[PDB]
């Protein structure tokens, strides 16, 4: 009930600054004046087919938790973003009989329809050596390749699978389950 007037607010006091060294040698303030421009050596990493993970011979479809279905395939978008290569695993562990897919044999316009206007999606068309772009389902692919890499993504506005520059980026993944 009693209201005692408190004083105005001010900044807490601060210690004074330390003195600034004039006796510095300058030669030791910087380093040795001779400098070499930096050079980097990136560890090349060849990409082979995972073999451990491949096209499943089984049929399944989690009818209650699939992203979108079309004809004889069910399509899931991984909720957690993953690496491009690691998604080979990420599709198998998601649901039974699910695997990394290459979209154009199914026609990707539907996939690109079910995306936002900024979100990307790793897709499963690759090239092991310097040959054709292929998927686990096989065949050849037209690809908008602009980088040397082997990985590919799609976006809302994508017309064709697009090669990516760094396959270590985290993005969701397109996984498929068969019904045949």
């Amino acid at each position: 009930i009693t209201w005692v007037p408190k004083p105005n607010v001010e900044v807490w006091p601060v210690d004074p600054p330390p003195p600034v060294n004039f006796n510095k040698t300058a030669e030791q303030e910087y380093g040795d004046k001779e400098v070499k421009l930096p050079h980097w050596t990136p560890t090349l990493h060849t990409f082979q087919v995972p073999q451990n993970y491949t096209k499943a011979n089984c049929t399944y479809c989690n009818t209650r938790e699939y992203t979108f279905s079309y004809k004889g395939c069910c399509f899931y978008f991984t909720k957690k973003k993953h690496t491009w290569n690691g998604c080979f695993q990420a599709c198998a562990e998601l649901y039974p009989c699910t695997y990394f897919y290459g979209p154009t044999p199914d026609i990707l316009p539907v996939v690109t329809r079910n995306l936002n206007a900024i979100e990307s999606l790793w897709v499963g068309v690759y090239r092991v050596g310097e040959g054709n772009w292929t998927s686990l389902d096989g065949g050849t692919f037209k690809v908008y390749q602009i980088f040397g890499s082997h990985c590919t993504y799609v976006s809302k506005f994508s017309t064709v699978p697009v090669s990516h520059h760094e396959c270590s980026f985290l993005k969701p993944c397109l996984c498929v389950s068969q019904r045949s």
């Epitope: 049929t59 399944y60 009818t63 209650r64 039974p96 019904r179």
Partner: antibody
């Protein structure tokens, strides 16, 4: 030669439990690329798919809305057959029951189908 | 989800018969056509819109587009008088057709 035949009691009293079993031959109940479905046909309800079961990594069972809390479909790997149980049956359940093979979309090969009537 | 097929269709013996099945984006799904002759168990006559099971007359054919799926029987001979049902799978539901009774005139 893929074939399968139904069997079980054809008469069930009101409330009560309905039990049926379909024995298959020419294929495996543990098939990796199939599903085993129970489907009933009645003039009142048309052609309604009751349920299905399959085996991949584990045994999975899928059921329809009209009998979600009442249906159970259990297989048997030994006799290569699969059963169907429907508790709390009503006169609406009077129908001809078939079993069939399928692949999630289509239902390939059907059973002979047995008529189940309810009237106490 | 809503499979609408004509209650009855008629055709003269020899002329091509057409049975239709409508629904929202049925062209995005795999339509199956089953034939049930009177007093018989349903038998798959067409699957995957156009694919035919082994041992089905080539007169039976199927198409799927947008909101219409058509099952065309070119021969229309004997034994074709039956009830034809379309079947699709919208999410967690197998939707069967109401039923199209085929009448073989002539």
């Amino acid at each position: 030669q893929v074939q399968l035949q139904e069997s079980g009691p054809g008469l069930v009293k009101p409330s009560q439990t309905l039990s049926l079993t379909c024995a298959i031959s020419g294929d495996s109940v543990s098939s990796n690329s199939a599903t085993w479905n129970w489907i009933r046909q009645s003039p009142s309800r048309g052609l309604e798919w009751l349920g299905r079961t399959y085996y991949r990594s584990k045994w999975y069972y899928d059921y329809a809305q009209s009998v979600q809390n009442r249906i159970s479909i259990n297989p048997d790997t030994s006799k290569n057959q699969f059963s169907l149980q429907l508790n709390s049956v009503t006169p609406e359940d009077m129908a001809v029951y078939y079993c069939a093979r399928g692949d999630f979309d289509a239902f390939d090969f059907w059973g002979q189908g047995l008529r189940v009537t309810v009237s106490s | 989800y809503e499979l609408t097929q004509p209650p009855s269709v008629s055709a003269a013996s020899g002329q091509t018969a057409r049975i239709t099945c409508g629904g929202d984006n049925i062209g995005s799904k795999n339509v199956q056509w089953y034939q049930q002759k009177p007093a018989q168990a349903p038998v798959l006559v067409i699957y995957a819109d156009s694919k035919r099971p082994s041992g089905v007359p080539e007169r039976f054919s199927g198409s799927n587009s947008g909101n219409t799926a058509t099952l065309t029987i070119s021969g229309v001979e004997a034994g074709d008088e039956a009830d034809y049902y379309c079947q699709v799978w919208d999410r967690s539901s197998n939707i069967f057709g109401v039923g199209t009774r085929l009448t073989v005139l002539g």
